[PDB]
Structures are given as structure tokens and as C-alpha cells.
Amino acid sequence: LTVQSERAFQKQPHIFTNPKAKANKKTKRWYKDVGLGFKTPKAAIEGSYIDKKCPFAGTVSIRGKILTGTVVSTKMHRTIIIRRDYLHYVPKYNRYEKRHKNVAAHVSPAFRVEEGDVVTVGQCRPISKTVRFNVLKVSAG
């Protein structure tokens, strides 16, 4: 896995590394905290990946609803699907029935998720036809 794997050069926007500088030849990296008491993974501070839709190094912002669910598919590139289980109340029978909804969320390379983990995802702006949420926390399962 390499960062410059596309026909275009991959880089963080407006982050300029001046070649006429001192001997500290370390590529300047930009990052941000998403807020809401969520910790920035050190794979973002020390990593090299470029992801414009990542919450920490990209331009997306986390705002709205925070959801939790179970990862059921990692077969897409940089995108996962989580499964949310809930109980629906049926007043006539004074009982419940199990229901579920699938919500698609984007996962940045700063996280590594496999099928079976329980993740917490935060809402972001629409970044695809079906993806509007972005992973904020991972719990191993």
C-alpha cells in the first residue's frame, strides 16, 4: 500500500513543503480534532495516507447524530457498511419486534476495521450517493 497509487499526485490541499528549507526533511502534515471528546488516532499524526474525506486530516466536519453499529462488510475500498439493530414497539400487541437498518459510513485509513467490530460513527456532509456518516471510534469484537 502506497500513497501515490493513483494517476494523479496525492497530497493534502494547500499544505506546501518548501524544498528550499532546512535539513528537517519531514513532510508537513495537517490534521484536526473532530470534537465531541473523540481522540485523534496516532496513525493520523504519524501516518502518511491522504484522504480528503477523513475526519482528522481531511476537510469533512463531524456534526449531527452519533450512531453505533456492527461492521458487516469491508469489501469496498475505504467504505464500510454497519448494521444497526433496534426494537420496534407494536402497541396493539403490547410487544416488540426485531428490526434493523443498514447505514453506510466512510472509514479512513487511520482505523482498521474487520467484519464483527462494533463502531461508533458520526454524521458528516454527504460524501457519496449512500455514504453520509464517518467512523469516529472502533471497538474490537
Place this chain on the structure above:
Amino acid sequence: GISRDSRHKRSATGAKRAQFRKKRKFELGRQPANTKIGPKRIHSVRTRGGNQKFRALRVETGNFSWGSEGVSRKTRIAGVVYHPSNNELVRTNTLTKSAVVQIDATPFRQWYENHYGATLGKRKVERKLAARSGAAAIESAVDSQFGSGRLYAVISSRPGQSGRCDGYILEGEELAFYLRRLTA
């Protein structure tokens, strides 16, 4: 009319959606500028809210910046040598964003020689130059190009949106990257 609505698509489950309403004016699109190189021709577009956009259909020059020294000059664009999106854009020399072009090197060589005193390609003024000396050694792979008189640059402005074709000169590993991509 060209429409950007997502209603005409089928849903994530694959179901075709029935026709909900007639096309609305607040979701229109227009046609691409497909900017070429030729005598300057820009047409304005009246957009929502009464604002204005500028379609650059053909331009010759643009303002390109040499980032390390922080100086920008307006220079002609010779042609498009590489485009990460579509090779038909390289073949027809269509100016879009992120297009790799060759620009005239004279304004930058002239600034360099007046500012540092060295050449490229390979009392007070003299004191100012002696102070500025030492920082005048630039990378070999960028310096060699001035001999050919043409610098590699990438367009940063959006010509179909502002009518301008502006950009910056390639340097560092980005420059090494597109040289390797171009030569193959």
C-alpha cells in the same frame, strides 16, 4: 435541461423510483467550457442570485507562482503534456483543473537573475545580491528545465468557473512524480 438531482437514479436497494415531479430550475447544470488554447475568449454566465461566472473557452496566458521563493508572474502556456483525468484532454489540449502544462520560463529566469545573480539551464545592488547569495542554489531537476525554456506547471484555478487559468510550478516529489509518470 441538465439536472443534478439524485431522484432520477435508482435507490441503494436497486429499486427504480417513480417520477416524482417535473425538473426544477434550482438543480440545473450547464455544459463544460472545454477550454482550449487560442486568442482569449471568455463568456459570462448569469447564475442563481444574479451572480456571474466566466467561461474561458480559449486562453493563452495565466499567472503561475513559484512557491518556494514565493513569487508569481504571468506567462504564456505552451500546451498540455499530462492530465490525470482523461487522456483525450491531453490530446486536445483542453485546460481544466489539475492539468499539467508547459509555461514560458523567461519572467522567472529574469526575476532569478535580477534577484540572485546566477543563471539557469546551466554597489548597493551587489551587496543585496551578496546577502541573498547561498539561497540561490535550486534543485537540479528544476534548474535543468530552464535550459529548455519551459517549466512544468499545474492549473490551480478553475477556468470554466472564473475564466482564469492560474497555477503553480511543480517542485519536490510532486515534480519527480509527474516526470516519472510522463516518461513512463
Place this chain on the structure above:
Amino acid sequence: GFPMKQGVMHPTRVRLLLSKGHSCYRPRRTGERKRKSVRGCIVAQDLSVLALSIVKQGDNEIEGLTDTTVPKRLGPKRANHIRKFFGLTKEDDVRDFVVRREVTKGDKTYTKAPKIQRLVTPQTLQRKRALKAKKVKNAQQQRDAAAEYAQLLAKRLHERKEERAEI
């Protein structure tokens, strides 16, 4: 009865999408465009009438066309137009050279004259002075409100200077 339109090179009729500024059409509401049939610019045998303008006068007088003349109904109204048409330099007073057409209502007659536009008057100069005085006074009110805030900031900053030293 369909009129002739300049630039349509046909002796026949064509249908064009006419808009504002085109001849042979008057839009009823703003932005309205109508598809109308119009006659070409090429003279043919299908004309019921042809309009002609005399460029060079001929030999014989025309009965009601070349012997008489009709005066223009209205005189000039803009001030610079009065100056250009006939009569005065920029230092002259245009006010007493305007042509007035007198109307006869039975026995008593009075004159009517146009209201001069772009005429420099003491009210006009007073408004120009008022605009520039207001602009200068405003600029001073803004730059001394800014100076007052700079005093407020310098006082607060000095207090924070002693606050850090104390703590």
C-alpha cells in the same frame, strides 16, 4: 400586412423567434419571446406597399412632399443638448433661450416650456457639498471611534500586563 425585417435574405416569409430589441415585434411582458412569421428583405411582387426615402431631390416638385415642410413638434430638453443644437457656450445661461410654444385657450394665452435636465443649480451644488461633507465627517467618526477602541484595548492590555506579573 406582415412587415419587412432587415437581414432575412428571402423574397418569402420565414418564422423567427423574435425578442426584445428586434424589429417587427413589441413584447407584451418582460422577457416574453414570440415565434412570428416575417417577410424577407428581398423585394418582390408580393408587396402591397413599399416605403421609400428621398436621398437626392429630383427635377419636379412632388405635390405634398417636396414643396412644404413640417416643423419639429418638440424642442431640445437636456441642457447639453440645448448647448449642442444651437445658441450657447458653457458660460451662457440656457434658461432664457428655450423655445416656448404658446397655446390659445379662447382668449387668454400662456406659454409652455420643457423642464431642463442636467441643469446646475444651487440645490445641486448644495447636495454635492452635503455628500462630501457627510463622507468626510463619517470618515473622521470612524477613525476616532477606532482610535477610542485602541485606547480601550491599550488600557485592557496594560491591565493584563500587571495581572500576569501579580499572578
Place this chain on the structure above:
Amino acid sequence: ARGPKKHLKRLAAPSHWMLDKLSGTYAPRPSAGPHKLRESLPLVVFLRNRLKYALNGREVKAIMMQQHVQVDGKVRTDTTYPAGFMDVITLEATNEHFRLVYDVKGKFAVHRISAEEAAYKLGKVKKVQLGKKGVPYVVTHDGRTIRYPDPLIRANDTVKIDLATGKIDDFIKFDTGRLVMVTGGRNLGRVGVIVHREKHEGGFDLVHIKDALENTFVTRLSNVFVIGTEAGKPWVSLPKGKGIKLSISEERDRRRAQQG
């Protein structure tokens, strides 16, 4: 639908106006102005349903076209001008000054004040940020933008505006113990002091307020308007009832004793 609405159905008008059902099909739609539509009071409603100076909309227009009504020290001729909370209405022909303050029952009280208090008003700072040419400014709740504020002012504070120069007379910092009136929800019109602010980041901060009768209620931070530096020291006169909410049994007993 294709553009902004210009009518307001009578049934869809805000309920705190107390309009009757059967006088007609429509209600006065407040114009665009300093206050939001649902939280405003048009001058036709103020002058006709509350003060009963005008008998109908033609007469309220006749009243206002004679230049009598001033809002915040400026003459207004818009009959549907959206007058709102804490606004000062001056009618110098009758030499009367009113303030629009919510009473504890949820409606806009007609609270008349003297001209000296009618010479100013308070506005809650919604945001402070820097304008063009690097000039900081504060936007209050009635949409006013006042530049060069006291550098100590932050959001949710309340300022006292000179109202003739548009400058700031003085301010109240948002902190524990400040007197507050609630400007939204079902506790509308109540007055008390802040006891505890519970913050919810990315969400809504909630404020716990203790009444003068030692009643405690919770409300959103967006509905809180600071009106005084401590208990019993408001910067404006409170309407009759002093913003104390009584239960229906106490109100019934008080009304029985007062009228008999």
C-alpha cells in the same frame, strides 16, 4: 413553492397573539424585520387588539401614517412591522411609552414605562466576531450589529444600548446567579436566577433556574435572556405579576379572594 409566502392564515398565526377565530380568514403576516415571525408582534396587533386604539386595519394605518408610532426611537410606518421582545414603543401624542416584555402567562404584556427607562433597551449578544477592516462586532437578538464592543463581551451576555447612538452603555456577563427571563418553551415569561448550567457539546446546553419562590425549572440556553445582575435587581421593570408562575389552584384562590 416557487418563492416566499406573503399571506398568513388566521388559524396558523402564533397563539400568543390571542386572535379570535371568526373575525376573518387571515391574520397579519409580520414583515421581514429584526425579529422572527413566530416570536414577534405586529404593530397592527399591538395597537388594535391590545391597546384598542384602532378599531380596524384602516384606522391603524391612519394612525401610523401620521408619524405617531416610534419603535426603538425611530418612526415606523409599516403596519406589519415585527415588533418583538424588549422593544420600546413610543406614542408621544398620548405621551405614553410601552415595553414589549413577556408576562409569566406566556403572552406579550403591555408594560408601560416612563420615558427615562424608555430611553434605552437591552439586547442579548448572539455572536461576537470580526468584521471587515478587522473591526470586531456583536450582533444582538433584535438583529442589531454594534461595532467596537467591550472586549470582555462574549456570547449569551446582555448589553444595555444607548439606543440614540447605538453604543453600549453597559453589560452583564453570563454567569451563575444572574437574573434571567426565559424567552421560549412552555415556561415562557418566568423570571429567576441561574442555579446550574449543564453543558451538552454538539447539542444544547441546558440551564437550571431557581424561581423567587424557590421553584426550579430547566430550559434550553437559546431561550435564556439575562435581565439582571442578581435576584431582585433587574435592569428593566418587570410586568405585573413579577414573572412568578402560580399553579391553577393558587390562581383560583387568589382570584376568589381578590374579587370577594
Place this chain on the structure above:
RNA sequence: CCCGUCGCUACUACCGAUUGAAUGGCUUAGUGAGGCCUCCGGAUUGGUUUAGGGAACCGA
């Protein structure tokens, strides 16, 4: 008490040659009005305006 052929009357649905018929939705393929963008074009119509008959070049 009672069951079933067969016989008579009426009604209902079913099957049924007609490659039956009609209406509406979706759609392959072909043709394709019209608008919009673009490309030239340059009816005529003003002079950056210059000119001792007026020959250039600017705009719409």
C-alpha cells in the same frame, strides 16, 4: 328417511378457433421537432476614430 344418472326451466362462473380486441405503464432499435451552449457568419450601424476621391482599423 333418502342417493344418483336421465328429462324440463332460469342464472352464474369456467374452457374455447379468432397468431381476438381495447386502455395504461416500462422498454430494445430507428427517425427526430424545439430550446440551450458552442462554432463560424457579417444584413446594417456607431466611430478607437484617421483621412485629401476617401483608402485603413475599433465596437455593436
Place this chain on the structure above:
RNA sequence: UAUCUGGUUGAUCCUGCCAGUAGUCAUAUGCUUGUCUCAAAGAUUAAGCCAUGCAUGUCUAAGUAUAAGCAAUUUAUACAGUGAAACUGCGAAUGGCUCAUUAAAUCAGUUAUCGUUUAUUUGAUAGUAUACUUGGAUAACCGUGGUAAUUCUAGAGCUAAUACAUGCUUAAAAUCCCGACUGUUUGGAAGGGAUGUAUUUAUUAGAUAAAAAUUUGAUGAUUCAUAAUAACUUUUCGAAUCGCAUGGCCUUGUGCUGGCGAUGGUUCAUUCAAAUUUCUGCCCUAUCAACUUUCGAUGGUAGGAUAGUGGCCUACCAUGGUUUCAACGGGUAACGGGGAAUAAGGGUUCGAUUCCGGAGAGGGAGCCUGAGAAACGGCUACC
């Protein structure tokens, strides 16, 4: 009122239905009909077709008046009162009707825009590096008209603008670049350019864990606000406008200054809005079990387009996405909801229709103007 009664038998007790009984903001119809208040009403079948008339126009002291319009002589020989018609501005995108389409669609409650546009209203905001005030058109009008016919308009002669296109008037410094000369240890300098605001790039501030060997805002969070540098621009606008009053200064003037108002103008904020948007919730059907992905289906990179996010579209590349927790398909005598009828409790049925949202104006589709329309009492094309 938490209720029952008749009917299978020679008689009995049951299962079980038929029938009886009461209501209906539930429709029709029959008979009858004195009074008062309140009051629904072409929804059902045909979102089928329409004769005829009306439903969207608008002027104040304050844009344009030589009506050959009326009126009086009056502070007036520039006009001044009143006032048709037109040009300019604004509205006509609101309202009213209907419910055909539409089954995760609309809608309801709940979110977001740090993902955008925003006429108007309300606040702020502009000294910027021929001037006593710039141009040439045009309407109404007059008189020559063509067509049977329309809210058809053409030649010719005038003439106006807050219409159109251009253009000055001005603070004090200070800062930056080039730089002849000069000092000559790196300083001093004559002379040239540039500063407001918009646009587009590139690069920098935009800090904030507690002692030893000078400033710096907000947010939960930003590449935010804001500032600076280098340039850039078929150069945005920094009032060539209109009404009432006429004040102040005297080194003998149409001098210099100035009071209350209209309208406009750049940006920011606000409001009225708009557009997308999170979560959860829709009736029947398996005699619908697999659906989506040629030719966008799911995602990535780059671009284009948009006011902006986004397969919205394009190029390249992967093979993904939904589903027995009922996907997909089909039906709906389905506009959704607030609600209505009946109801001990639990429920069943209805909701085209006074309020909210959405959609449509015979069916599609495409557009002009405008802040706002894919508008139909606007246009273009087809049926």
C-alpha cells in the same frame, strides 16, 4: 348501560351462523315540514370538454409631462396646480382550486448546513493614490400606411431619465518594490511606481501544560472570521438623481458652507424564505424469491457542472449494494398528517374536503425575465 333476543328438535343442551338492536363530520333517496341561531355543498363516475362575463395591477411634496388635456393668474419667461397616455421601477413565483401521479416517495416528529443562494425589511459599512456636473439614442406625440382578422406593427420628423455607456472632484502620514548616485563594513539616498472594495491563484500570522541554564477572536471541532505578501482581472462600485425648507460667514458674490427627507449602491449580519439533510414510523399481496450492475448499479482518484455537498455527469479502476427482520415486483375502488365515527379497557373503520407539507393546471419536454418559476389567467416545440 362492561346488556342481549327470535330461528335447526317430538322435546333438551351445544357449536354455529342468519335475523333482530343502536350510532355515524355518512352519502343518496322517499314522505312530511311552523319558528330562531349555526352551516356543509361537482369529492366518489370524467385531473372529461368548455359558450359567455369577471378573477393583476400599481403614483407620492420627493424618476420622466410642450397631452395641440383641465384650471387659475401666480413667489415665477425653464418648470411649479390638476392630470389621461406612455417610458422607468415594482408586483404578477402571493392567493384560490383540485388530489391525477406518488408506497421509504409524500408526510409526521426529530436533526444538520463548519455544504449553499437569499429580492425585501431591519443594523452596520465606502476621503484611496469637462466637475458650476459627460455622451447618443428611444417612447409617448404628429402624419403616411399594410392586413378580413390579434394586446400586429413599419417607414419619416422630434424629444427625457434612478433606462443605457462612460467619467473627475480630497486629508494626514506611513509602508513595500526597483533603483542612478553615495557612504564604503553595508548605512544614506534623488527619481519612478502600489495602497479602498470586489475577483482568481500561490504562500504566510491566525499561538495558549505549570519553573530553572510584545499582541493574537470564535467553535465541541475547521484550510473559520480576520490580517499580510506576490501577482491577476474583455474592472464590480467608492451618488453626473429627486422634494421641501432656506439658515450661517462678510476681505460688496449666483461665493463658500448646511437642515429635514426619497431612491440607489459594496460587504457583513438579521429577517422573510429556499435547497439539500439525520433517525424512526406507511395499507394488501409469495398464485412476487431473489433484485441491482450492457447503457451508474456500490465505492475510490481526478475533473466538469452547480449557489453549493453528492455518480449529479465524465475518464480510469475495483466488484460491490439490497434481501425471509420480506428486498425486488404487483395491487391500491392511496394525496400524507393534524384529525373523525364508534368505542369499559384493548381495538375496528374513515380522513378528496376550513389548518400544515407536497404535487398539477389536457399530456410530456425545453426555456426567457427575474431574488425567487422549469411559471402555464408567460413563451417555444410535439401529441
Place this chain on the structure above:
RNA sequence: GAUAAGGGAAGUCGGCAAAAUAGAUCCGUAACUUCGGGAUAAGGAUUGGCUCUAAGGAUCGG
């Protein structure tokens, strides 16, 4: 042995004779059925020249 305006079996016992279709690649393919077929069903699109690009192998060298 060819061609033919407009019509297209009205000719004739009868479409006799002629015409039309035709190779290849890709898509799509009904009733019925002895489940093997029907099937090249039916019905559509493409095809030249030139300049390129990619894929598909062998023998030596550890």
C-alpha cells in the same frame, strides 16, 4: 442474361419465374416438447483504411 417510375400478387389453377435474406462478431430469442430440441427461431447493432496500445510464449544466466 440484365435494369426499371408509382403500386406490390390486383396476374395465375397455384407467388410459376425472379427478387429479397445470406459471411463473421456482439445482443436477443416464443408457443410447444418425447426435456434431447424447436434455434441461425423471430428481431437488432457493427464490419474499410491508417497510426497505436494491451494480453497470450521459448531458450539461457543461482
